[model samples]
Target chain A: RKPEVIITYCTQCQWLLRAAWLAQELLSTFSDDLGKVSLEPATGGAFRITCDGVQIWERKADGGFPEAKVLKQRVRDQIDPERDL
Target chain B: RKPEVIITYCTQCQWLLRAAWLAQELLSTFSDDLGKVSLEPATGGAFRITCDGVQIWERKADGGFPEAKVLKQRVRDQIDPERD
Candidate 1:
């Protein structure tokens, strides 16, 4: 399967602005590495990141959000470990 | 204790924009009745609103978010029942 990144956020909590921003960031950087990047809405304070059906991060379980640089690195490692992010 | 409003949100979920907006709205409307308004950070899909230690709304349990008018009404009913 192609590389896919899904960002699921809590609609009730109003997480659109930040979720969309993250989507753009990943899409721009991994234009070629990723097949698609999507924004998903869900209830609860859920903000999850997945790569190719594998869980990248879960806000509820992670304790805290990852920084931009850290997130980029995590994504890079998942899709292309050797790529310079 | 005095009337207080606390909003606990998931810092990882990036709910600050909306949570802060709600805080501003409540503060602007209930400036007189409320004693304090605080924004707290938490994990595990938690975005909760409480008044004087009583839960007004919880994002996870409530199923859906409260509209501004609905939230205002809930707050009013709790702090000042006669407030119309």
Candidate 2:
């Protein structure tokens, strides 16, 4: 099975659009390299990303939302370390 | 259950970015009004969109890819007719 990416965002904070844009960036970068990318809604000012159930990003822990390029690099490192982004 | 949107684009044509951008637009516009948005890779110069399993756009038949505003309008008509 390919790696799956999950983004959990704060619904109350209206972060869905941000999450969606990130998902777009990932799909655009990875394409067939990924199994699935999904958006999950939550509250309490949360924003998190996981690859194959492994945590890749957390807003509070990471200090902020990730730049698309940086996030892509992290995801690439996890899913296809040898491949270039 | 909310309506789900699916965008199928030509992989050979390298339309994944376009498809992904459109998915972003739809999710941004509809937000929680939509259940899910997905992208499906295909071939033969295809670009199609469906909402709740109903076809909303086809590149060949519709002449070209839909503008983000127009596509949002169509999706809105299907999923939330009474709202914007």
Candidate 3:
């Protein structure tokens, strides 16, 4: 079964553009590998990405936003290490 | 009477940073003239600023997030027109 990816951002930080952009990147890259990519809203600087309930990255804890390529690499590694994204 | 300013942001859009930053700018610039500055949360990309209960700016309607300096200028114009 394909893995589900969810990216949740703080509703207060005006981070929707960033979040949606990331989602688009992930979907575009892993169109076949991913089950679904979801963007949701949270609060308190909460920018988090998870695959199948397992957290992939967090904003506040990760110090800041992650680079687009780096984030894509991480997602690829988590979901399909052999796919070579 | 001093004018009141309120900043309401879409909690879902993660616009808190922009809102808080604007709030800080407004408060610092108009510390003496402003009666109070408050930041509240909402949804649907709700980034709106009001001075003395009058709308100052909006995110969706205004096309995007506002510049800090521009927003400050607007606030200053609305609340302290005679000072400058």
Best by lDDT: 2
What tens-digit string does per-residue lDDT give for candidate 2 at B1-84? Answer: 768788888877988778878887887767678766777666699899999899999998999999999999999999768884
With a 3 Å backbone cut-off (N, CA, C), the pairs that clash in candidate 2 are none
Q: Which residue pairs in candidate 1 have backbone atoms (N, alpha carbon, C) closer than 3 angstroms, thus clashing?
A: none
TM-score of chain B of 2: 0.96
Off by more than 4 A, model 2:
A11-21, A39-43, B11-17, B82-84
Error of 1 at A39 (Å): 0.5
> On residues A1-85, what C-alpha lDDT tens digit does candidate 1 reach at each position?
5577777666567765566567656755664466555555556688888877788789967775667787788899997898885
lDDT of 3 by residue, A1-85 (tens): 7787777676567765677567656755765566656555556777888888988788766778878888888888897788764
Task: Assess the local accuracy of residue B75 in candidate 2 as a C-alpha lDDT between 0 and 100.
Answer: 97
Q: Score the docking of each candidate (DockQ).
A: 0.02, 0.27, 0.02
Instruction: Give chain A TM for each model in order.
Output: 0.91, 0.96, 0.91
Off by over 4 Å in 1: B1-84
TM-score of candidate 1 versus the correct structure, residues matched by position: 0.49
